[PDB]
Ligand binder design. Structure first.
Ligand SMILES: Nc1ncnc2c1ncn2[C@@H]1O[C@H](COP(=O)(O)OP(=O)(O)O)[C@@H](O)[C@H]1O
Ligand SMILES: Nc1ncnc2c1ncn2[C@@H]1O[C@H](COP(=O)(O)OP(=O)(O)O)[C@@H](O)[C@H]1O
Ligand SMILES: Nc1ncnc2c1ncn2[C@@H]1O[C@H](COP(=O)(O)OP(=O)(O)O)[C@@H](O)[C@H]1O
Ligand SMILES: [Mg+2]
Ligand SMILES: [Mg+2]
Ligand SMILES: [Mg+2]
Lengths: 69, 370, 370, 370
């Protein structure tokens, strides 16, 4: 069981990292803008918050995986 | 919902979902048809293999490419590729999600209409959009002012943009790409004795190209060094347990990019096209385009292409002005990485072409924004 | 119903029913005619004995072989053999059941037509099919990718197949087989004093061949060992209570397979033909054929043939490739074991040539699938 | 002085002097080695016969070809052939005169160097030159704009020229020639019963090919006519006083040229290669190449090849364009007739490669003009 759950944790960590990369790319694109469309102004904040949430989730997952080890 | 972002290319098919960092599936765009009789009973007959299984069984198949030079030549085989991508590879019904496609600039109009019809009447997607390959690169790069240099298989094009105002008169298009390099590699490998003729042998030569090639900083000096000594030699192994030994041909294949007179063509090398595109814009914006150059496409992965490009452009361009070649890693997927970002944007979610809009307005709809 | 699977060979006849593991009856394909006067009264006047009874009474008969080198020379004798097989041996009327026959590749066309006519007009079977001997071996082996090396009496042939797509240009055929080895055994046994001339004496020499022969791993070393010492000697007993003592000839008979220059022929040994067949296919499939070799036929039962075959092919072929010689036991019946399996398959039950089809289309029918 | 013009071919050797209309000597390029023991005393022990005497005594020899597919495989035999040509056949010492040789396009570099070395170090000619086989045909034809279609034994190549500016990117090369047709003739003659295996038997089959063959204008109708009636039958006599009767095979051997799928090859017929070569040149010169096609080589002597070639090209090419197939008689020697003319020209007498030039510059000299 231990090995299977460790593998599942690894898969979840990989998925979280894959999400972080795309969100960081989108925020990197949106930052350069100078007079963004009103919708983009809200979308930038939404992505900024989602990045933080994903980073804490990644931290928690890695901590749990290390704890099992 | 998630919107598929497929990139029907000239030599590979990359399909995935929005909000990701890599295509979900990637596989060659070929169709293989059996060549021989077939003697065993029970095997169950198949008319034509498509995708990666065809590449697996290339021994007894006649591989054909539905696309060439960006244009689509054979349609019944391009539809088979799309069906395989949607059902077998991605494993998602196409009805629920919209779709985004990419088409090279200056292509024939009819292509766009036919693609639209095949994507509405037959597959029944609720909304489809098509974008220029070069533009999507700039989202992935992360800037707005630049001159992209997308060089896929089949064709290579330059599209300069400034403050998000694409200049349409400066766009340049050229038909030099990986396929011609593979053919030249076959032709020059003929000299040492190694003869490759069939299509599968061309597939082997393409792998030889991918693994063992590089671009010399200078050409004549490299030829002199290779002739005098024997240090620029590499050994490669065929599927038949035979050993090829390549010498000069390591850097005579990509060199045709900068000297198109090797294949008998007449146009100028890629550096001259980039310089001409830059010098065809207005006077006030040339400095910014010089500063921020961008590379994309697989063909621009040869070790040492960035350095030679920078050297040639610096030699061609006036002094006092700084040139950089933004050539990030993983440029291979750069175009696709753009599309997903473009799908994500909230504003863009208003720009699709709904099915009823195409039903009412007609085929011309797509060309209104062309 | 059960469908007969007869395998008219060059030196033996094996006849049986489908869905079995061995032929129901097996007997030599010879026809003996009396030679002498006949003096007693009341004994049945037989024009010619056929099958095993002729082999029993070989003393006063002139045995003849209707088949030779695969081709059929005498047709009355062949029809007599078939009648004996169907009525006396199998003891089943031929009208009720269909039949499946086997014919070696690259044989003359007329053979097939004449076989069909003799199997329809005279015997009146409701359906007949004919198959290539080499192909049926792969059903018995249990694979789909390979290079069979069927070696019967009379002739030997190689047929490479890949994913159930027989390559017809790589097929090879050769006229070196057991009969030539028997004749060479007679010729070389002449040296020690033993003189065998008549046909029955040839039959005795054939038994001598079967019992006491083997293939040396290396030839010159074996000859040196046999000359220096006297350990490679065997004693055999004739029907006349006489003792033959064989020495070197134990491994000079089969050796002609690898060195056909002993008989005055010019072709290359069997290993070279196999290697040439392998190298006449495409580049991408040579590894799979290298991995899976197959042997069949009676002639490949010599102790030690597999080891020498593997050694020779490994020496000839490039390194980095793994060669295995799939040489299962009971290979003698392998071809026949294929046919029964092929009969059992449900799909194959649609591929027969019904009698009315031959009546309408004509003799060419059989050749449509050739 | 007179300059020798040798044309080392793939299946024949033609050697002569400049300013003539035919080769002084013509003989096959084979080397025969004895196969049997040799029992009589007082005879001359010959290691190997070469040239025509080998063809005379083919019964007891193992004939081998030093050249194959244009490339030279065995060098000792080739040197023996050259010595026989210079001393025994022509009967002229090679020191006094220069020499001109012919080599097919796209051949390996090493060939040229080794040929040069063997013609300088060993034979000591004062000057040597080598020319492309296709180009010399245009001197004999008498024009300057054309698309030659030289088809010798071994290989076939197309080289388009316009106003004496050879286009190198349009050159095409293919490995279908007379030897493959001879092998196919053996393979298909196997059906009627006639089995030819040994090399001398292949030589007999080659004569059968030369005498009794033709190219049908259309194929399916010809097959139907040959099957329905029995008018397409010819009788030929072997050296053994036996009569072969050939039927369909009269026009299935040369048909391989237009349908290379008979041998399992995948390339397109010769008409498609000619059309592709024409269509790979510039737009403005295609009409002139269409107007003036040229044939050379022995293989293009089949009765009726010109008509079928014209019909196929006309069907393939657009209308409004006029196609002619310049196919003069005595085309067999056309290539050689070019060389002599090229030797005569006063200007060309400045283009040789003197011995001291090779001694100083080195082996690379020959490749400077390649
Ligand atoms: N690592 C590499 N090194 C050299 N050439 C490459 C490499 N990867 C891909 N290529 C070349 O790029 C071509 C594929 O281009 P691709 O990225 O598919 O462009 P597109 O998506 O427009 O088809 C191949 O034909 C191959 O020859
Ligand atoms: N155990 C054995 N060892 C050596 N040779 C054998 C053996 N059995 C049969 N043979 C040879 O094989 C021949 C029979 O071959 P067979 O299996 O009948 O081929 P086919 O089925 O094609 O007629 C015989 O003439 C005999 O010389
Ligand atoms: N009259 C003919 N009819 C048909 N085929 C011929 C004829 N003459 C020669 N050939 C074929 O052409 C071949 C000889 O070609 P050749 O002219 O020697 O080419 P090369 O000069 O390149 O050696 C022979 O093998 C033969 O099969
Ligand atoms: Mg691309
Ligand atoms: Mg058998
Ligand atoms: Mg020639």
């Amino acid at each position: 069981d231990l090995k299977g759950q460790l593998a599942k944790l690894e898969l979840h960590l990989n998925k979280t990292n894959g999400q972080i990369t795309a969100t960081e790319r989108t925020i990197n694109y949106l930052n350069k803008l100078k007079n963004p469309d009103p919708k983009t102004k809200t979308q930038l904040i939404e992505l900024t918050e989602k990045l933080i949430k994903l980073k804490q989730e990644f931290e928690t997952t890695i901590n749990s995986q290390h704890e099992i080890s | 919902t998630t919107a598929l972002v497929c990139d029907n290319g000239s030599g590979l098919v990359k399909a995935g979902f929005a909000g990701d960092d890599a295509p979900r599936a990637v596989f060659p765009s070929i169709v293989g048809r059996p060549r021989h009789q077939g003697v065993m009973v029970g095997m169950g007959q198949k008319d034509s293999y498509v995708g990666d299984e065809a590449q697996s069984k290339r021994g007894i198949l006649t591989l054909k490419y539905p696309i060439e030079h960006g244009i689509i030549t054979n349609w019944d085989d391009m539809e088979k590729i799309w069906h395989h991508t949607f059902y077998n590879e991605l494993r998602v019904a196409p009805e629920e999600h919209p779709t985004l496609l990419t088409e090279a600039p200056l292509n024939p109009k009819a292509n766009r209409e036919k693609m639209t019809q095949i994507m509405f009447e037959t597959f029944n997607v609720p909304a489809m959009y098509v974008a220029i390959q070069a533009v999507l690169s700039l989202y992935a790069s992360g800037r707005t002012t630049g001159i992209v240099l997308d060089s896929g298989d089949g064709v290579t094009h330059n599209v300069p943009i400034y403050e998000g105002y694409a200049l349409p008169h400066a766009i340049m298009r050229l038909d030099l790409a990986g396929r011609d390099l593979t053919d030249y590699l076959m032709k020059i490998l003929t000299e040492r004795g190694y003869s490759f003729v069939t299509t599968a042998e061309r597939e082997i030569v393409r792998d030889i190209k991918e693994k063992l090639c590089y671009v010399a900083l200078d050409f004549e000096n490299e030829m002199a060094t290779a002739a005098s000594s024997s240090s620029l030699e590499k050994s490669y192994e065929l599927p038949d347990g035979q050993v090829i030994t390549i010498g000069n041909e390591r850097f005579r294949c990509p060199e045709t990019l900068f000297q198109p007179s090797f294949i008998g063509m007449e146009s100028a090398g890629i550096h001259e096209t980039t310089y001409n595109s830059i010098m065809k814009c207005d006077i006030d914006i040339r400095k910014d385009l010089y500063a921020n150059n961008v590379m994309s496409g697989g063909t621009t992965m040869y070790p040492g292409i960035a350095d030679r490009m920078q050297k040639e452009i610096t030699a061609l361009a006036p002094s006092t002005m700084k040139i950089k070649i933004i050539a990030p890693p993983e440029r291979k997927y750069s175009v696709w990485i753009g599309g997903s970002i473009l799908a994500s944007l909230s504003t863009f979610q208003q720009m699709w072409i709904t099915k009823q809009e195409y039903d009412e307005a007609g085929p011309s709809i797509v060309h209104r924004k062309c």
